């Protein structure tokens, strides 16, 4: 009910408060790195992040108004995208590196078919940096991915009205930063178009996968 009655500031507050913590990996900087161990570390991390993601999703305005069947579908469609945009966000201040965790900061080299995805993630991080993406914009973008990604695959209408509210919120945030109307609409477009590279990265990721926790396998399932 209440997702459509929030002011833009309340929406931002809600999303910021919902933010999951930054988890650590088990990287031991002594261990020689296997291929298997590096993937082991990332799988271990992602699996733990999924638990926080599930509980973050419940706090995205509108998400609990959806049937439970629909919540499952959205998270199944969006989870990798959401992990990826989080990774790109925390990697922003580390040019040429990906901060998977505060104790796990990898460069392209340590990649390697992962190198291809790593390059795209680095490029995405490079783009957010150039645009000077703000935290408030980031949390909007991430909620959009959740709501958006599976929506096309009567209650669809509620999701679209919540999506509209997040757009209003992005616009509000930009007007407050002093952007002209033209600038607001341009930046809005710029941010949204990124979501399409991100969809792209998630799909190429799944494709390249074809060492996994029980939860990951159950969600990795929904893309085949």
């Amino acid at each position: 009910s209440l997702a459509l009655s929030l002011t833009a500031d309340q929406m931002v507050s809600a999303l910021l408060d919902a933010e999951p913590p930054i988890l650590y990996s088990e990287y031991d900087p002594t261990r020689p790195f296997s291929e298997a161990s590096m993937m082991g570390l990332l799988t271990n991390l992602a699996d733990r992040e999924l638990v926080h993601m599930i509980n973050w999703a419940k706090r995205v305005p509108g998400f609990v108004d959806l049937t439970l069947h629909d919540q499952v579908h959205l998270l199944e469609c969006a989870w990798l995208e959401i992990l990826m945009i989080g990774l790109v966000w925390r990697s922003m201040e580390h040019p040429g590196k990906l901060l998977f965790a505060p104790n796990l900061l990898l460069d392209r080299n340590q990649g390697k078919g992962m190198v291809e995805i790593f390059d795209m993630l680095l490029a995405t991080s490079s783009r957010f940096r150039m645009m000077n993406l703000q935290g408030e914009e980031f949390v909007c973008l991430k909620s959009i991915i959740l709501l958006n990604s599976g929506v096309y695959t009567e209650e669809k209408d509620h999701i679209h009205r919540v999506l509209d509210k997040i757009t209003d919120t992005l616009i509000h945030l930009m007007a407050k930063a002093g952007l002209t109307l033209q600038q607001q609409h341009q930046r809005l477009a710029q941010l949204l178009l990124i979501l399409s590279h991100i969809r792209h990265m998630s799909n190429k990721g799944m494709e390249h996968l074809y060492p996994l926790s029980d939860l990951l396998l159950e969600m990795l399932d929904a893309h085949r």
């Binding site: 638990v51 599930i54 999703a57 439970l68 919540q71 499952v72 029980d214 939860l215 159950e218 969600m219």
Partner: peptide
């Protein structure tokens, strides 16, 4: 699905 349970408290 585990996901489905975790979505329930």
């Amino acid at each position: 699905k585990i996901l489905h349970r975790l979505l329930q408290d």
